[PDB]
Amino acid sequence: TPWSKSELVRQLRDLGVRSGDMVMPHVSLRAVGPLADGPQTLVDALIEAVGPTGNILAFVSWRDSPYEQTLGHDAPPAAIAQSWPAFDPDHAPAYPGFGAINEFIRTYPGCRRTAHPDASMAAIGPDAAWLVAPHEMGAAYGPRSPIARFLAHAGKILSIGAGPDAVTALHYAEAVARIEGKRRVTYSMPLLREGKRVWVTTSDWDSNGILDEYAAPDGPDAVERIARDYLARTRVAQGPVGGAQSRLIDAADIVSFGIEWLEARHAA
Numbered sequence: 001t002p003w004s005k006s007e008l009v010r011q012l013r014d015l016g017v018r019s020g021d022m023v024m025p026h027v028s029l030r031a032v033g034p035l036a037d038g039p040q041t042l043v044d045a046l047i048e049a050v051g052p053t054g055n056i057l058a059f060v061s062w063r064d065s066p067y068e069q070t071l072g073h074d075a076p077p078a079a080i081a082q083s084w085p086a087f088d089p090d091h092a093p094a095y096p097g098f099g100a101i102n103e104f105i106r107t108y109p110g111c112r113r114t115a116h117p118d119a120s121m122a123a124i125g126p127d128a129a130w131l132v133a134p135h136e137m138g139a140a141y142g143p144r145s146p147i148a149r150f151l152a153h154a155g156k157i158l159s160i161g162a163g164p165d166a167v168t169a170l171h172y173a174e175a176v177a178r179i180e181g182k183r184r185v186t187y188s189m190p191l192l193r194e195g196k197r198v199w200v201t202t203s204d205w206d207s208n209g210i211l212d213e214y215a216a217p218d219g220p221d222a223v224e225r226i227a228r229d230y231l232a233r234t235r236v237a238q239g240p241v242g243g244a245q246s247r248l249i250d251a252a253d254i255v256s257f258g259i260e261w262l263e264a265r266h267a268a
């Protein structure tokens with residue numbers, strides 16, 4: 001019997017979501033199980049749960065981000081530069097690998113979209129415009145990003161059947177951690193500025209592992225390491241949303257822990 005919107009709202013209330021909250025969801029729809037009207041049922045429940053003064057923030061990225069195609073070059077390679085689609089925030093599909101629910105979030109009426117094509121964030125609520133802009137190339141997840149503003153606004157991270165690697169806000173801890181050997185990446189994104197397509201090349205922190213030892217593709221990254229150590233140590237509201245085991249995490253607290261975690265393990 002598929003979960004109804006009102007059943008999900010009650011479960012979110014049980015978990016500790018309150019009207020007015022600013023929530024960042026990370027969702028496994030397979031863990032959630034069948035929904036009355038598909039993924040939209042959970043989007044609707046999240047919006048009801050946070051109320052008209054609350055907010056939803058999601059890391060949605062872009063299905064067609066030219067990340068690997070431009071990585072490590074000081075300019076987009078010519079064949080990429082000449083034909084890649086410009087990122088059009090109100091028309092760009094979410095990256096499917098960060099959750100199929102994100103395409104439902106970002107197409108929700110009134111949803112806003114940040115201008116960083118690879119780190120793109122989607123936001124719903126009165127603070128959505130303040131959350132999504134600015135989002136400059138060179139500020140993907142650290143200071144001046146939407147995640148930084150989320151962290152300054154008592155954000156809660158809502159993990160709904162998702163693994164400990166799916167805690168994007170921890171990339172803020174990596175950005176500001178005073179440790180040696182931090183990995184950086186250089187890539188190019190095609191933006192729209194006044195309807196004109198403009199290639200921007202930038203460097204930023206490597207979001208696939210802030211240090212070498214965390215960036216092997218067949219091992220856990222720093223986000224997962226930090227998140228597992230935090231969840232092993234911290235009382236966190238836990239309970240079902242649909243069929244999925246869920247956690248409601250204080251975003252400022254886990255990011256503070258992560259900064260401490262990184263700085264304790266690596267010299268300045």
Ligand SMILES: CN[C@@H]1[C@@H](O)[C@@H](O[C@@H]2[C@@H](O)[C@H](O[C@H]3OC(CN)=CC[C@H]3N)[C@@H](N)C[C@H]2N)OC[C@]1(C)O
Pocket residue numbers: 061062065067068095118119165166167168207208209217221223
């Ligand atoms: C759309 N462009 C993408 C580009 O943004 C970047 O995505 C990052 C992404 O992997 C990270 O998620 C995975 O991280 C790891 C360890 N590597 C294991 C499983 C995931 N939790 C996320 N935390 C931060 C993202 N920025 O690289 C891939 C890409 C497809 O090119």
